[model samples]
Target: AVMSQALKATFSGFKKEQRRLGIPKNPWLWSEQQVCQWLLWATNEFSLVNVNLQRFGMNGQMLCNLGKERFLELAPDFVGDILWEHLEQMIKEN
Candidate 1:
């Protein structure tokens, strides 16, 4: 049962987050506080258990500039990939 329901909940959580955070002009305009807020929702959605918020204290423009490589360094491995996908979804939707 755990196996059956696992991956399906990923974007169900996405809709929940979108409702609260709202689709924006872009996340690049977000304050560091909002950017940190987004990271909390994202790590929760993806079940990443060890994010240190200090590494992500920058604003949205700083995040966007780092792109995937630096994002991988900060978020690490599986989370890096899934996290980037979340960002891409937000950026494309706007």
Candidate 2:
């Protein structure tokens, strides 16, 4: 998959957020807080509802190891699904 207007905004905002959060050039180097920051933005981006931060302690490098099933265990199916997809794209960009 390539991107959408909203997704274009997402990527733009991601870099903006990288500077805003002072994170890293890639997800592989993102800390847990940075990952959560990204997830928070994605939650807003997709209207992902009632996402619990309870189980999302994994850092970006650690999160890359998760499959859809594992991501689902951490969040709702839709939230997990979008997050997983975005993660794949973000990693690809790296």
Candidate 3:
């Protein structure tokens, strides 16, 4: 659910910015893997979901660490909620 919410929020931000022509500078653009990294941060600040840093890859799936280990299936769902809060903050900033 957190993943879904996060995706929605991220895309929503893109959409809003698209309308205003005010895309917030994603500093992580150089990395080109910003979404995954952003999700990492979001997962922490909005800790209601779960993910494995050790199992994460820039392009996406972390099967190397997660498939063999099943990290998330092993770990607990995190706490807090992020996407919505971050979107609200961005709205204020804009």
Q: Pick the candidate with the highest TM-score.
A: 2
Candidate 2 vs candidate 3: the lDDT winner is 2
TM-score of 2: 0.75
**Full-model lDDT for every candidate:** 0.71, 0.74, 0.41
C-alpha TM-scores of all predictions: 0.72, 0.75, 0.28
The C-alpha stretches of model 1 lying farther than 4 A from their native spots are: 1-12, 15-25
What is candidate 3's lDDT per residue for 6-88, written digit by digit as tens?
A: 55545444444334443334322223254345455556544535554443444322321223234334433432233334433
lDDT of 2 by residue, 11-59 (tens): 5566776788787877899889988898788777677767777687878
Clashing pairs in 3: 47-79, 48-79
| Candidate 2 residue-wise lDDT at 22 | 88
Error of 3 at 84 (Å): 15
lDDT of 1 at 79: 65
Tens digit per residue, CA lDDT, model 1, 16-51: 565677634477787888778777876776667777
Q: Ranking by lDDT, best first? A: 2, 1, 3
